């Protein structure tokens, strides 16, 4: 009925970053999260091992810098009433919206999650929801504009998702709350 789903990725440990922000680590504790959807770029099993301490169900797709080449390129999952698609995004050449709507139809999902830009974004179009959690470490990218650490928590109940977007802004964890309802 009620499911908390953690969505994160682009940690880039240890090449670009060595850990998640300590304030995030203090919030991410076992016993709460039912599933973890990861956009990839961990990049090593050490960060995979960390996620498995948080939840018994971890789903990951292959980022362009992951060490594990067995990770699938894309994943579709059904959680409650929602079909959720997952892809790292370094394959999306114009996060372009005509491409995302196409991917939404190809995966046949209510929610499409992707990463690779390290910029948190979320929007709704025609009763489909598109999420990018950003980088949970605030890892640098090419030509960046600052790059705030961020991750996403989805609160899924019946046909409503309430998404909480956690961001490390200055010295504080700050949150935005999003509602997504499907017909």
């Amino acid at each position: 009925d009620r499911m908390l789903v953690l969505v994160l990725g682009d940690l880039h440990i240890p090449h670009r970053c060595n850990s998640l922000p300590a304030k995030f680590k203090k919030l991410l504790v076992p016993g709460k999260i039912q599933h973890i959807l990861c956009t990839g770029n961990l990049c090593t099993k050490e960060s995979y091992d960390y996620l498995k301490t948080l939840a018994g169900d971890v789903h990951i797709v292959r980022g362009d810098f992951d060490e594990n080449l067995n990770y699938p390129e894309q994943k579709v999952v059904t959680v409650g009433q929602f079909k959720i698609g997952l892809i790292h995004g370094h394959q999306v050449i114009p996060g372009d919206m005509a491409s995302l709507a196409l991917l939404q139809r190809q995966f046949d999902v209510d929610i499409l999650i992707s990463g690779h830009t390290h910029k948190f974004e979320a929007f709704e179009h025609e009763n489909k929801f598109y999420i990018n959690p950003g980088s949970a470490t605030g890892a640098y990218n090419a030509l960046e504009t600052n790059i705030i650490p961020s991750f996403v928590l989805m609160d899924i109940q019946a046909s409503t998702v309430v998404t909480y977007v956690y961001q490390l802004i200055g010295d504080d964890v700050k949150v935005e709350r999003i509602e997504y309802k499907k017909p």
């Binding site: 908390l4 919030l27 709460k32 928590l153 609160d155 909480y164 977007v165 956690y166 961001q167 802004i169 504080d172 964890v173 700050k174 949150v175 935005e176 709350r177």
Partner: peptide
Amino acid sequence: XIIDTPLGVFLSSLKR
């Protein structure tokens, strides 16, 4: 202002 969340109470990140 502030927002209650499953992981605790935090400041809102909204620019307004």
